Amino acid sequence: QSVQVFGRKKTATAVAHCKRGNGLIKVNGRPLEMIEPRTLQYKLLEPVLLLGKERFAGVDIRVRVKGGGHVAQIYAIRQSISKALVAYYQKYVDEASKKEIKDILIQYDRTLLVADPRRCESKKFGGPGARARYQKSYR
Amino acid sequence: VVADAGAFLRHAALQDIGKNIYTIREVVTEIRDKATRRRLAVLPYELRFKEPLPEYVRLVTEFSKKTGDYPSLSATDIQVLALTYQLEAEFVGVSHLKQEPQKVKVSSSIQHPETPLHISGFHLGGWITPSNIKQIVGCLTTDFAMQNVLLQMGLHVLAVNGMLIREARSYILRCHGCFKTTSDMSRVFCSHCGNKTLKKVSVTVSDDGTLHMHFSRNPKVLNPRGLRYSLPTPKGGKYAINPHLTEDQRFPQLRLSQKARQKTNVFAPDYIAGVSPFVENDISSRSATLQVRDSTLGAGRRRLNPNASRKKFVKKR
Amino acid sequence: DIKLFGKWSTDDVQINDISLQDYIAVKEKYAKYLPHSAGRYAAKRFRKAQCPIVERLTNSMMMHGRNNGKKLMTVRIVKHAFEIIHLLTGENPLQVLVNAIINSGPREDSTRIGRAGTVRRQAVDVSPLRRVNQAIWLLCTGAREAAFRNIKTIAECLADELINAAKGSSNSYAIKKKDELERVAKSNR
Amino acid sequence: PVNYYVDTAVRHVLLRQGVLGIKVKIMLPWDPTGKIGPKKPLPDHVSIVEPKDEILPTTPISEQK
Amino acid sequence: PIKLARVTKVLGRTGSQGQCTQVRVEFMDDTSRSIIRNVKGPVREGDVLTLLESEREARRL
Amino acid sequence: TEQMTLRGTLKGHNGWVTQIATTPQFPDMILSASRDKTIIMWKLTRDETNYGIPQRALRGHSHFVSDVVISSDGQFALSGSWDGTLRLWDLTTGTTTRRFVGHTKDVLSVAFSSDNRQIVSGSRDKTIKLWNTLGVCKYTVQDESHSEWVSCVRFSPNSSNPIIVSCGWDKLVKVWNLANCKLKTNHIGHTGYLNTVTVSPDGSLCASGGKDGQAMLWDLNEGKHLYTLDGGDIINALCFSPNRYWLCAATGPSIKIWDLEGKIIVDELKQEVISTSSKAEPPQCTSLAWSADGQTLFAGYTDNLVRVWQVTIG
Amino acid sequence: GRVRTKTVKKAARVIIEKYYTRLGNDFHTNKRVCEEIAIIPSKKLRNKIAGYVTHLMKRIQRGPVRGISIKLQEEERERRDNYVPEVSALDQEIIEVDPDTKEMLKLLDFGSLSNLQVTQPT
RNA sequence: CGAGACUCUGGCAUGCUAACUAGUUACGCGACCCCCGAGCGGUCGGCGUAACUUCUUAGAGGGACAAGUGGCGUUC
Ligand SMILES: [Zn+2]
């Protein structure tokens, strides 16, 4: 009667718990509309604004977030919101609802169900970064 | 109306009058020209794919060696003629056929084989008058090895020329050694005895199949003159050049560099930017240092007899 | 329905040129709520034509040195820029965006051909994807120039270029720079 | 495998005119250590099992023990 | 006047530094007269150009 | 006089279907083991869109799934895999109940009993392991057992001394005597490696198969070979109908149907359309499951699809 | 690019030579039989070996490649080498013969052969 | 020999092994809110047992080989 999965961007890792509920999606204790960098508010609303409220109705969602930065934590949640409703619709609802609703998300963005593996490269000596090098001078 | 790969190579889009069009699936997949696959994309919905029966195939091959074309045809070229055989047994009267037709009836002439017998711009008037390049039930085949086997059965077919066929003017190669005619014009060595004793033989085939063949009775071709000369030691190595005796002895891989082998496609107007108005000559590679030349280049020096008066400073290949 | 910024729709937006049509984004299934998407669009070649062209206007607006990673700064400059377009024109500003892009990218460019020390450009053709890439660059750059050292806002001065190019007017920066590259090319031919 | 096959040894031997310095490397073999070589073989070497000869039957004889 | 195009084949990449691209061009008035061109920038098979002259000849300076 | 027809075709997988089991208790849930590491419980629907709906996605494995078998009641399932672990399922929820670790290599087939309490298993470890429903490790039956990969082990639903059948790739078909688990009857008749065994619902015939295309059929009572059949391509799967006294066989592109009274070939089961990709090999046939309806055959293909078969009589 | 190596190529061909019968067209069954026989190092190497074995099985199922020497395929080859047609091309009726060839066997006391045909000399 | 193979790293595992110096879930207890006109609900990095490994950590094992398909290839 309960399914708990994670999502993940660079170092952020957001874990969403879902159970048979009444339509609450709270991240880290506070509502979705309250999370501060509200310039990216719709990116957190995209699992709701594509599947409608009626799918998030017999489901209660807590999200537990650590790590990353502001933007990286925003994208780590919207993985985990989306991956959980998919994983909730597998175990408790038939597979045909899972396919129906999984296909609506992936066609909007593949990111919502599988994560970027691109993480930060190791800096090497002789320059400030991973590929960059210092100035040099001739003559 | 059996369709052939040569009909699409010349792009004979004539699916409008003949409407019983059957063809082989293999002879359209073997074509390596992309404009034929472009032809395959839209138009050939009016035709139908079909294969002939193994009873029908073997009876085609019986008089194929009796018309002397069975090695001259390809393997896919066999089935297309057997594909016409089921169509003729289906629609047309079989009672008007023949097989094992007729003898040679040698028409020996004093005409040299290399004379321009009906080459278009050559005249002995006959101009070009720029309309005539396009003026240069059955089938549409442009291969004479295909066209030879048809008219010996007495099977009138057509071509990109919409009229039926009555005249078949071409050239074959008879072995002067073992008396073996092949319809191939490309090879220079024999298929039965393997010598360079193939000689040019002009034919003339009617619709009934009146084989009458101008064997060129002229001793400039019937000549033993430039035919005996001593050969160097047989040389084995990466860069040895043995003087091309057989059709298949293992030559070493000698190839042109692809920056030398390619010429100019000077027709194409994507042309302005960059280099000189000609192709760059290859002076850098070791294809050029070993003096590797084209096999087609220098062929007139092959026709020169070995024991002759070469100028005192030449050296060929 | 998927409104950009929750208030701008995509089905009104109509592309004129067929040359640019497959290389300019959102009409129908590219429709996304925010420009910020952060996907790998430069993973291999010809993938940056499938990303929404508002995000293309975003990523070319963080471009200068002091601004050089700040994307949420930029999707705010975009958001306030469309609503200045709508209040000056009334049109769906995405249509004003596309009509400013199409009129901006030049169609023939010069190219240096010859040996070193010899300057003889010849006119060549401009690719459709590059004409998209050249236009966005010419649009964003005009927002810097009339707004580097005056009171006007870059969420505002972007919307003055992005209107003056959809007119194809002489007042835009991205039009004068098309009227030069494509003027020089027809003296190279 | 340079770090578990060769054995580097470096010295400083003295003479009248100066110092010579020698270097000795001993690339160890396989056949794990009875004082001799490492356990793990070469990561390039691909030892394939020798062709094991098997008896071919012709008639279906059921050898029931 | 101003015509259009269809990239039929990408033939090569010309120019001094390897910059321009040599491209087989169909017209979009579906005339089979393929005048073949050089572009600036990335071009793949199936694109569509916009010319200001179709009078570019295969001429060398 | 009876024929088959390609009735319907099921779509749920990315990976190849490896085993399908039917059940007489529940004629609408039929279960598909697959190589995308998933097992789909299919709700049979026999509509116009498809013949069945994918209902449950059983997920408990980490590698390719090589077998699946249900209980006499249609609520439990048991499926070996190439993770080495044998996973007991519960069809009502989609959650494991046991987890049978005890093989080292990839487990190929899983022995299920008519008693519904015997699980004794054999893998690519070439090794028979004694367990129970609990998973109680009795003994490692290896003592003169095999020399190659144990491909398939089944039981006999027999009222006599019950008989197991454990083949290998070592061309052997063996009979281990239960209450001893000790080897009595051995069979040396095949060429090439063996792939599938099916036992008679009578209790008197087993049906071996393999690479050579020829399927030895053995009398189980006396221990003597009875019928060799021929082959087209490689045999992958065999099944026995209870009522019709037939033998169905998985050829590569096709299915060769038999009649075991006169070696009578019945029908060939295949559909290919496009001749452009004729150089591309046909998608192979992998599994085979007689439905206890008497009229329905299910086979899974290397093109990750299950196609169904219905008997058109006359 | 992605070019295979002698260690990949020369070692995979030995598996073909000795144990062709157990091989098949799968990547993932050629790979599971590869560890049964090849005492390999790390798994990337055996994956490249098994992939070349699978590609080589695909190349074999057209016809024999140069690198193989199979105890099973060559007996298959000899039983496809023995194409024995009905009429060999050395048992024929008419073979056209030059007049200068004709005078030899009259001198080499085989002028009694009747299968010949002296033709019109060209 | 070098190249490659190799070692480390990264990416994947709702599969396995585990966790009072890592947690999650649940159940107690408390604080607080709107209340309904009791609650329930909720937030608790507030603190106590139990269920266990998704998150954390680190061990073994799998995973990808140009494998599959379509073209191009002196077709390898
Ligand atoms: Zn000859």
CATH of residue G50: 1.10.60.20
CB contact set of F314 (below 8 Å; sequence gap of 6+): F1, F2
Helix, strand, coil % over all residues of chain A, rounded to 5: 35, 20, 45
For residue F163, the SS3 value is strand
Q: Which of A112, A2, A3 is nearest to A50 (CA)?
A: A112
Calculate the angstrom distance between C1' of H6 and CA of D5. 12
Contact C130 E40 (CB under 8 A): yes
Specify which residues D9 forms β-bridges with.
Answer: D24
What is the structure's resolution, reported in angstroms to one decimal? 3.1
Residue G98 alpha carbon to ligand 1 centre in Å: 12
**What tokens appear for A60 in the block?**
């209660």
Calculate the angstrom distance between C1' of H32 and CA of A29. 15
Q: How far is CA F199 from the centre of its chain?
A: 10
Q: Where are the alpha helices (DSSP H) in chain C?
A: 18-21, 53-59, 71-89, 93-102, 128-145, 154-164, 173-176, 178-184
Compute the distance between CA of residue C136 and CA of residue C53 in angstroms, rounded to an integer: 9
Q: How far is CA G20 from the centre of its chain?
A: 16
**What tokens appear for F78 in the block?**
């048991």
Q: How far is CA B229 from the centre of its chain?
A: 31
Residue G100 alpha carbon to ligand 1 centre in Å: 16
CA distances, B135 to each of B130, B205, F293 (Å): 10, 20, 71
Of all nucleotides, the one whose C1′ comes closest to residue G59's CA is H76
Contact exists between B and A (3 or more beta carbon pairs < 8 Å): no
Distance from the first to the final alpha carbon of chain D: 51
Q: Is F283 on the interface with A (CB under 8 A)?
A: no
Contact criterion met (CB below 8 Å) for F190 and F171: yes
Of C114, C124, C129, the CB nearest to E42: C129
**What tokens appear for E48 in the block?**
């569509």
**Secondary structure letter of residue D65 according to DSSP:** -
Specify which residues F308 forms β-bridges with.
Answer: F8, F298
Could you write out the three-class secondary structure of F7-71? EEEECCCCCCEEEEECCCCCCCEEEEEECCCCEEEEEECCCCCCCEEEEEEECCCCCCECCCEEC
Chains that touch E (3 or more CB pairs under 8 A): B, C
Greatest pairwise CA separation for chain E in angstroms = 34
**What tokens appear for C72 in the block?**
């949420």
Of F106, F193, F281, the CB nearest to G32: F106
Nearest CA in chain C to A52: C1
Compute the distance between CA of residue F162 and CA of residue F181 in angstroms, rounded to an integer: 11
Compute the distance between CA of residue B284 and CA of residue B289 in angstroms, rounded to an integer: 8
**What tokens appear for C153 in the block?**
């806002």
Which amino acids of B are annotated as binding site, given as ranges? 175, 178, 190, 193
> Which residue, chain included where needed, has tokens 């190589």?
F35
Q: Is D63 on the interface with F (CB under 8 A)?
A: yes
Strands, E assignment, chain A: 2-8, 13-19, 25-27, 30-31, 60-66
Q: Which of F236, F247, F159 is nearest to F199 (CA)?
A: F247
Helix, strand, coil % over all residues of chain C, rounded to 5: 45, 5, 50
Calculate the angstrom distance between C1' of H59 and CA of D39. 22
**Cβ of G62 < 7 Å from strand H?**
yes
Calculate the angstrom distance between C1' of H5 and CA of F64. 29
For residue G68, the SS3 value is coil
Q: How many CB atoms lie within 10 A of CB C109?
A: 24
CB contact set of A101 (below 8 Å; sequence gap of 6+): A51, A55, A85, A86, A89
Compute the distance between CA of residue B2 and CA of residue B87 in angstroms, rounded to an integer: 9
**Pairs of CB atoms within 8 A across A/F:** 19
**Cβ of A9 < 7 Å from strand H?**
no
**What tokens appear for G57 in the block?**
């099985």
Distance from the first to the final alpha carbon of chain C: 48
Distance from the first to the final alpha carbon of chain F: 5
User: Domain tally for chain F?
Assistant: 1
Compute the distance between CA of residue B121 and CA of residue C63 in angstroms, rounded to an integer: 68
Name the structure determination technique: cryo-EM
Q: Which residue is closest to H24 in terms of CA–C1' distance?
A: A4
Q: Which of F296, F240, F290, F250 is nearest to F270 (CA)?
A: F250
**Cβ of G122 < 7 Å from strand H?**
no
Q: Which range marks the domain in which residue F220 is found?
A: 7-314
Compute the distance between CA of residue F127 and CA of residue F171 in angstroms, rounded to an integer: 16
For residue F124, the SS3 value is coil
Please indicate, yes or no, if residue F118 is contained in any of the structural domains: yes
Specify which residues F21 forms β-bridges with.
Answer: F31
Q: How many CB atoms lie within 10 A of CB C67?
A: 15
DSSP H or E run through D19 = strand D19-20
**Secondary structure letter of residue A110 according to DSSP:** G
Contact A75 C38 (CB under 8 A): yes
Burial class of residue F200 in the structure, from the number of CB atoms within 10 Å of its CB (0-12 exposed, 13-18 middle, 19+ buried): buried
C-alpha torsion sign, points B262, B268, B273, B275 = positive
φ, ψ of residue C144 to 5 degrees: the values are: -75, -35
Q: How many CB atoms lie within 10 A of CB C114?
A: 14
CA distances, F197 to each of F32, F173, F240 (Å): 19, 9, 10
Chains that touch G (3 or more CB pairs under 8 A): B, D, F
**Cβ of A26 < 7 Å from strand H?**
yes
Q: How many CA atoms lie within 13 A of A62 on its CB side?
A: 9
Q: Which chain B residues have a beta carbon less than 8 Å from that of G122?
A: 108, 176, 215, 217, 222
Contact criterion met (CB below 8 Å) for C106 and C134: yes
Q: Which of B49, B59, B52 is nearest to B24 (CA)?
A: B49
Contact criterion met (CB below 8 Å) for F131 and F88: no
DSSP H or E run through A84 = helix A70-91
φ, ψ of residue B140 to 5 degrees: the values are: -140, 90
CA distances, A103 to each of A14, A97, F306 (Å): 22, 10, 22
Q: Is C109 on the interface with E (CB under 8 A)?
A: yes
CA distances, C115 to each of C119, E13, E41, E59 (Å): 8, 18, 21, 18
Q: How far is CA B100 from the centre of its chain?
A: 24
Contact F124 G32 (CB under 8 A): yes
- Name the residues in G31-50 having a C-beta closer than 7 Å to nucleic acid strand H: 31, 41-45, 47-48, 50
Compute the distance between CA of residue F288 and CA of residue F303 in angstroms, rounded to an integer: 15
For residue G122, the SS3 value is coil
How do the domains of chain C map onto residue ranges?
1-189
Compute the distance between CA of residue F106 and CA of residue G114 in angstroms, rounded to an integer: 75
Compute the distance between CA of residue C170 and CA of residue C144 in angstroms, rounded to an integer: 17
Calculate the angstrom distance between C1' of H70 and CA of F277. 9
Please indicate, yes or no, if residue F1 is contained in any of the structural domains: no
**What tokens appear for F191 in the block?**
């060429």
Contact criterion met (CB below 8 Å) for C80 and C72: no
**What tokens appear for B267 in the block?**
């027709």
Contact criterion met (CB below 8 Å) for F156 and F199: yes
**What tokens appear for B114 in the block?**
């290399």
Q: Which range marks the domain in which residue G16 is found?
A: 1-61
How do the domains of chain A map onto residue ranges?
1-139
**What tokens appear for C187 in the block?**
């003296």
Contact F57 A98 (CB under 8 A): yes
Q: Where are the alpha helices (DSSP H) in chain F?
A: none
Could you write out the three-class secondary structure of G11-72? HHHHHHHHHCCCCCCCHHHHHHHHHHHEECCCHHHHHHHHHHHHHHHHHHCCCCCCCCCCCC
Contact G21 F124 (CB under 8 A): no
Q: Which of F249, F254, F257, F251 is nearest to F312 (CA)?
A: F257
Please indicate, yes or no, if residue F104 is contained in any of the structural domains: yes
Q: Which of B102, B89, B99, B83 is nearest to B21 (CA)?
A: B83
- Angle made by CA atoms C127, C133, C136, in degrees to the nearest 5: 140
Compute the distance between CA of residue F239 and CA of residue F219 in angstroms, rounded to an integer: 16
Contact criterion met (CB below 8 Å) for B214 and B199: no
> Which residue, chain included where needed, has tokens 């098997």?
D54
Q: In what order do the strands lie in the sheet with F296-300?
A: F3-10, F306-312, F296-300, F289-290
Q: Is E18 on the interface with C (CB under 8 A)?
A: no
Q: Which of B92, B49, B75 is nearest to B145 (CA)?
A: B75
Compute the distance between CA of residue C81 and CA of residue C77 in angstroms, rounded to an integer: 6
Contact B106 G119 (CB under 8 A): no
